[model samples]
Target: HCNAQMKTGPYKIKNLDITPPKETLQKDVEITIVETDYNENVIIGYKGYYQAYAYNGGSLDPNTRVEETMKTLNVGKEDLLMWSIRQQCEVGEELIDRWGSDSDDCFRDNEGRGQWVKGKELVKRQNNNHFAHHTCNKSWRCGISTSKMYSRLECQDDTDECQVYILDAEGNPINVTVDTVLHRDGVSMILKQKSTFTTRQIKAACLLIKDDKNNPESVTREHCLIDNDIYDLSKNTWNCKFNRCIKRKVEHRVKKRPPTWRHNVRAKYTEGDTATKGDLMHIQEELMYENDLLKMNIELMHAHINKLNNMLHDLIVSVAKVDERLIGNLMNNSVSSTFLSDDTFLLMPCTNPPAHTSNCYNNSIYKEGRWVANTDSSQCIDFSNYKELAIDDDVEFWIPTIGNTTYHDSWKDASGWSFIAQQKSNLITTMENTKFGGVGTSLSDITSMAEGELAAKLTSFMFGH
Candidate 1:
């Protein structure tokens, strides 16, 4: 089912090389999903939904029905030039200026996850030099350095205020902490939702300093400062104090971790990222290149299809010739095998009248007073034009089935028998003439007598007095 509810994003159109558009048409779009149900009877087992659109704020029109019986994951190319999804991030007001956008290039960052940008872009907003995303407060911390001694900057406990003293290589205390203390109500109360401090929360982590250092005591370190110009505040540490740079976070709210059509492929973009016209054009060029590759592949596929058809045709002709050869070798030939003394055997038809039926004929063969062989009725053979039955010397009887004949080993008298034929012979027509005057013209006798007279008087002789 093409559920409109499954879609979510208001994605931006990225690829438009082959198809261009406006209100009359749609361009590239976004789409994705993973198998939700494994071991399902049908192919569509993916769980969750998808999102796609043309403009940044565009939405899928509701109350719409798909045209035909659609297949899984197959949206019409005509209906959609390409898939698109929104790629933007949102953040709190305090994290505006320095929290995001300038630190990284959002476009080249997300692994080519998106084509164009639409929502809040970081660089664009960077020009305003606005947004208060700073931690504001200051504090001290130690570090584990590999190349050189170093320490990182951090926000103080709660108030956006603090003080610090630095010791030069001469081992002299030099105070360098910011004197302007923007202290306010306890941070918990002032931070209804969201700084750093000097009261119970912020004091000093100085071991060498006097008892005024009420923070804590540590053996390896003391509270002091490093000259920003002489020792480089950007890198190392000794036994001193520092403030935070707030490792730039991709601060966002409206677009944070939100699902996009590319969510299935994990082609995610941050909330603060945006798309541009140049990016779209580059995407167009890429689209053109992909179309060319696709065309080439389709031609190759056609060539293979033609080759397959040719091979099938050749096989059919070969099969036909084989069957023709078989038909020519079909006629009967008189070839005596050592396994059989002779193939001359009398065939019998049901003798309880044409209305009868049974497995074995029960009409044993008779010849010159000796029973030549018992009638073995296996399967029926055509009597009229039975050129395939026997050699020229043997009598051929044709017994086509009555409409549809039962070909099971069944006995009408008892239950049933196995390892035997299911039908009796149809040769009783010949013995009827002789049995008319015979002393005891019985059904069994006639059955046995038919083959006798057919071979000549043979009839009465075989039935002897």
Candidate 2:
């Protein structure tokens, strides 16, 4: 059944694909994954270590120069190795077809070629002595010390029996190939030679996955590796590939708040009129206490002066024996004869002793001694004999022997001249200037107060002895 299918050409015999079962071949060796610099003219080479996938198809034959597919493990710009490696046939036969016997001229090996080898029949051979001093003049060398000496002999060769070769392709390039390893295959690879990278370079070379299935090439993905970064460009900004280094936004935000009412109210003058404030409140309190003390001293002085003046007035009226109500009428300027006769009629002695006894009295001797115009001091006068004179309070004094005219004539220039004059003058001065005195009453001199004082004295003589 299998032969019939083959004759009908339904089955085609495929060429046996040689994949290295060992770890040294079939995998993309990573150099260093990195990013492109901004406006940078530098090129980063992908020189990664590689191992074969677990899928083993055939043993690597050193007789053949192997060819395989090489592509970026993911996709995009930094994923590229500048140009891809296009491998076309198995090892030995392909090398002979490209360069003939004349191609071995640059070698020091028995084979006479450094990188180019001659193919005879099915097996491929190389000069191992060529590995001692190989050289490559290229744009970026993988940094093997040899003047380009070969370390790799057989790429994908199952046996350890080959050397490395570097082929000069472009004006600035000498592409290297390890004869025993780094064979063209599909695997992950690092895209940079060194790890020194700027933040922008890291962003450029990173790989990400996208979700668009209709056009797969149009989709690419990227994400930030650091926090506090913002993306503001497009809604799907994380879904695109990057080739150049991109810088983060340098803008920051500031939040403002409104003033509180706690600070808006008027101040209570806590410092009491000083700016730098500095304990001035305590100083102000001390000053206020001093000012209050001064005011209290002034008030006390006024009250003491008033009390002394009042005592002097009382002493004058007492010594002169003037009418008390007359002085009141004089100071108040009231038209009342209440003091003229009331002293004699109103005076009454209490029955009780000492404390309870009335201090009120009248003089009967003054009336008996020809109404007190006495001539001698040795008159038989009854000092304790007080008169009970009767008169109305509201009526004028119409004494049968002492009328108003006579009373006035006898009133002035009465006894106690020095004391009366002193009292009247002091009282008048005080009354004229302040409230403690009768300022509004016009009690200005002894002439005015004499009438009232004398009236009181005459009434006292009529009552008190």
Candidate 3:
């Protein structure tokens, strides 16, 4: 069952090793730990206290002799005696230890030889009779007192201890076991007395679980104690402030919009536009009314003007008729019989009103250019090529074209006498300077205007009447 195949000698353990060697203690670790300072277990000779740490395990000290770490606690000596304590100490070399016996020495409580006290207790213990008074300084009196009094013992035993010892006459030291207190250890100075310590770690290592792996997690598994102080400001910039305000109002929020305006379009009005519209409508209507009235007045004036024109035309025709009728009546009433005789025509205004005749009853009219004196104004009888009839510029009066004869014979007045307009242009003056006789009665008096005034008088008569 063991090997399945064969059998062997005695049973031997298999497959395990015991090969490597153990270490010899080396001096590498420069620092070392200590438990207690003095002998952890020692019999007390008097009532006292030894303080290191104030609690259990408080004495986890390193032997730095690191002076800062080693501040001595203030232990009042007077309070010590007052509290019935004979001695007290909290450092190392001040622990009690056997000073080695000389075989037959005076000891007590069954102890062999003298031992050092825990703290410096010489003067104090002597005053209190803790040491045997001595006139008999024979046994533990390996030496003398500081005062030369044959008195008793102990280590002037404390300040800077160990390097001192009990020496005899030739300056030889006694076989003392001072090693009972602060002696050499396997590593460093150890405190045989127990103690207490308080500890704190400033920075700590932690892993945070990331991506499902178990990373070093922080305190309280990363949900740290973060609720510190609430700010008077309460939070971050906008949302927190707004929310706080809203909550203060006992509401969350509401939307507020600036008042929006409604849009409308309308027409703009100016002065001219107003005139065309309601504002100007008043003036426009009045103007239209005025224009209509003005048209009526103008038409009325035109009607009166046309009526006057026709009436004046009628009046002129009447004057013509009256003029003819009166002229005929005067001829009948004023002259004698003989309508056929030429003498009846004389002294009558010489072919005046109602007569159409060519007669020079007064003077002959002449223009200045060319003239010739000739005979009777009528001759259809002969034609001859032999005669070159004379025509001269100086001659006066006009003669008929037939032959030079009488001034009155020009056919221009065939009724037997030639007459002039206004007495043939009034040839009465030095009218002869014109190479002829007629400056004539060129009516320069604007005398015809008087004739126009007579027509105007006709207008006055019609209107005034």
Candidate 4:
């Protein structure tokens, strides 16, 4: 039901270590669409045609098809990486069902009653920076002056943008103002998608559609429902300043609350006509409570990733070291690898069954020529003279794909992701460590590029290869 196309980049044969002059061989794309008739069947609701190209682009193009497929399949060194997605889909489904049909009401941040709650939560978080900077109370506030009176009070003001939304989930529409369109997108909706189906169905859907629930994937807060709705300009906005957030405009000659002064040390403020310590204290408490929670969540996520990474590393190394010479021998054979050579090979015989009158027998062994009865299906290898060489490729051009690397930085920034940093140091080390390094680099270049340049040069290097 899916129209999927695959293209390959130009191929080059080069010396082991020296950089190749021509990086990529050929690049092509298979653009497919969920035709209108077939749209309902595919999990990807969008019927938009997407082109997935395969080739080594010299940093200008997107990832090669080979790498993209591996990621979708989660083909790690040890085993197929399917566990992460399984966990997300499972837990997410539970949460959705727990809310039941009312689940939308409880989690929806865009509309309904939950919007106000979520909006207030976001605003509270946003105000934290101001609270920490200026409004916080340094000393325990009692009536009497605790310490100094004449110190300096820090004044801080921050500029920020806001988003508003109208949520619609609990079988009815509830109007609420929020700082984000979280209810409109992200988990709010995806969770709904999960809730719409059973667990077994979802897993099957994952297998059938998404390939798997991608886990161990770090989603940015900005891309999260809350953040995306509130901040991402590219996406649709539920309420663009639709409802005025509780706003205030001070236009008095002398403000109701005046300036307050204090230092980190014990500070006693004059009980002037301006501000009261009570208001400042409340803001401080709220800010601290929120800041602590956010900090904790970020820390927790990091720890989880670190633990998973270590486990993955151990698993991969173990798999590599396992003794399997017997299996290797069988893998070298075409039949075992799912590669076809002789058309009449014993495993799958070309049927000449009763009265099979198809003109396939008249097909060409080599294209642009008359048909031959040879066992080879050389037509599949469409390349000209190179068709012969391509037919010889065993392991089906096995190429490795590195996942989600973000690079736009110095050597220090790049080194964090480096597994090879322990051994060598260079531009490739920094480049390879970052995701940007391999855009155009060839497979050979990745293995041997200098540490710093490995990542940066990878994109261009791939194309050169």
Candidate 5:
């Protein structure tokens, strides 16, 4: 089939093509299938022309050089083909053919030179070994890079291999790959060769290398590893005190709560005062007890006062009655005679049968004009030829008596001497006793109280009695 179609011809040559025209010889040498068919009467012979070139050698078609270049780069044919396309060939001036010898020969115009250089200098790119050993000189040829040395000392966690390398005095490096089982001390530097290196050079080369991600331990060491002292992670804060590495336990500062009313009270008690919380509580309890007792005592006093008031009221009324009776008896017994002689009459206190028959007596007269002259006179009344002499109150006896001159004129004057007295004995006796004995002795003694004391007793009577 031509182009996958049925075709007839006299041995026709068709479907001829190279699969990839731009690839290197190291890859598959493939071409389209050349087919022939005979449908015409006569057959004619056909001829095809194509050109091929060595991909790796310059002008000399050194076909072996393609495999050699591939081996040199340690790449397979497919990888070489991709490299050829990626770099794009830059044939040399002498070579009319497009083949090149090496990676640099294929990409002479700075295209694939970078890969070649990287591949050739594997140690430089592997761990910056050139920078690590840059300090090496003729006299001090041996050098150590702490980074590489540490890496050589360090091993994978699952591996027993711990290989160490040290530079000798002659500038040759020795790779001493010892199993951890063989070297019980694990990976270490060759001390015998390292002895030539100065301590300053060793320190300049040594470093505590940190990883990419920020670690607190690493950050702490950045500050701590100075002047033989340790430091906290905080800025300018040292962790070493008095030649000791003080372990810093970083804790967020705790905020204190504001004082409440109770806290203020407690602070006052503890600071200014000497009272503790328990002591204050005890004091408060005692104060409460005392307050309760005081209230109880006040209540008891009020009750007692009320009781006293009731008794005082009773005593006052009793004494008032007794004074009334006593005054009535005194009035009755003192007035012994009522002598009438035509137009004159006299009411007089008897001397022989006196009022009390005790030591107390009234040698007093109730006569006109001279009644007030004798201060010893108890009471008085004036009647001079009058039809009626009315004593209205104690005032009738309180003033000096004025007698009438003659019977006709006295009868006329007696018309102005009209007095009216109510016969209520308590009022009468109290007034009479007050008039004679002054206010201090007005009432019969219930209690021996002064004037100030009487006021208190009377106030209690009205308040509660």
Candidate 6:
């Protein structure tokens, strides 16, 4: 009958009817609250009607779900709210996972620690490039020697000065004290031992830089890594002072000394110390003696020429007288024989003939017409009409005495004049022989001149013929 009753509108027995509990059919709903920050989302749990609840802090109005279910289950509102909030947060995390890392927002410091930086602030200025550094002064120093550093850089200006970050051999920064600044403006550092260091007491040793910027145009010993060595960077050559690489200096010229004889003569002429007044006086006396001897020789020649002229004149007169006497004798004899011609021409005998003669006859002649015979028979003298020509005894005596009478005393007194007289006589005799034939003619045959004119006449006669 119950089943027949459910089928009143044709409701079959395939359907059943049931009723729920009164607590499950509770018509009231309750809400649980949650607190969140201003940037966060909040959730609330309520009765199970399968409703999701979410709230933003910036939302002006929020929707709430508080509904009734036909059935009842034992679940806490706080647990339902927590699960709702957790589900909202997980959705936000999953949206972020879809994107990648933020490179524009991340950056690193000098020590390589990562941090956030804006895109415009992150710039790379430091790297290996053409420029040496990022400063207006680009010059650097190289190859400067010092106890603290083996070499150093010298810059043109303070702005271009080198940055010296001194470090130990292991590359740790070290502290140093300034010792001295050289005149060339090179810096020198003091060296000391650290109390903590035993094997390496000194911190930083000298360091040398080669071919760096701000190098000198010509290298010097100051630019070398070792002492006394010089470097030429341009030509790439090295030289040492002890090796005698430099040229020697030229020496000054000097004058030469004069010869000995030339110097001595100059000293004497200039009245120097070596000459004396006595020496000069002796020289002058010798010159005077020579002058006197020359004068004497000239006077002797003149005297000899005068004596010759006088001797020549005297010889001519003496020869003329002797010639007169000879001709007078011959004329008398010839006239005596020719007195009677053919009659007087008869042969005569000698009055003084040889005693062995057979006969001795004579030609007779008359003296003043008288018939007379001659005791001295001769052919040319008849003693007839013959007269004796008279002669002066003084003239005869003077003939042999004719000579240089100007200074003559007598022949016996002619001691000094003998040489003079002989020389003049020889000269006249030679002249006479040359003029005539070699046998010579008597002086009477040639004309004689006065004593004063004889020299000029003899010269003309000697050369004219």
Q: Which window of ten consecutive residues has the lowest lDDT sum in model 5? A: 135-144
Question: Which lDDT values do the candidates have, in the order given?
Answer: 0.29, 0.32, 0.29, 0.28, 0.31, 0.30
Model 6 lDDT-worst window of ten: 89-98
Ranking by lDDT: 2, 5, 6, 3, 1, 4
State in Å the error of residue 372, model 3: 27
- Report the Cα RMSD per candidate: 46.1, 65.6, 82.2, 38.0, 69.1, 83.5
Q: What is the lDDT of candidate 2?
A: 0.32
Task: Select the stronger candidate by lDDT from 1 and 6.
Answer: 6
The TM-scores, one per candidate, come to: 0.16, 0.14, 0.14, 0.17, 0.14, 0.12
Expressed as tens digits, the lDDT of each residue in 379-425 for candidate 1 is 33333432343353222112111111345335532322321233223
Query: After superposing candidate 5, which stretches have Cα over 4 Å from the reference?
Result: 1-278, 325-465
Which candidate leads the pack in TM-score? 4
lDDT per residue, candidate 3, 323-411, as tens digits? 33333345555322222242222223222234324322233322221122434454323333452334632112121111123434443
Query: 351-427 in candidate 6: lDDT tens per residue?
Result: 32333322224554434323367574543432334434355211111101112134435544444457568678787
Per-residue C-alpha lDDT of model 5 across residues 1-465, encoded as one tens digit per residue = 237657656786685332332221232111111111111111111111111222322335443222211011122233333333343211111212332324233233312222221111111001112221211100000111111211112222332222222323223444433111111121122122221111110110112234334553332122223234333333222222111222212342212223335542454334453547998899999999878877776776677678778977666545543233333344566343332543334554533433332222255443431222345443334434534434631111111112223323342233212422333565688777667544455356555565768899999999999
Top-scoring candidate (lDDT): 2
TM-score of 2: 0.14
TM-score, structure 6 vs. true: 0.12
**How many clashing pairs per prediction, in order?**
43, 35, 28, 53, 5, 6
Per-residue CA lDDT of candidate 4, range 249-354, in tens? Answer: 1221111222234476443554557667998999999999878877776776677678778977666435533322322343553221122332221232132224
After superposing candidate 3, which stretches have Cα over 4 Å from the reference? 1-277, 322-465
**In model 5, what are the clashing residue pairs, if there are any?**
9-39, 56-100, 56-101, 231-239, 392-420
In model 5, how large is the Cα lDDT of residue 140? Answer: 6
TM-score, cand. 1 vs. native:
0.16
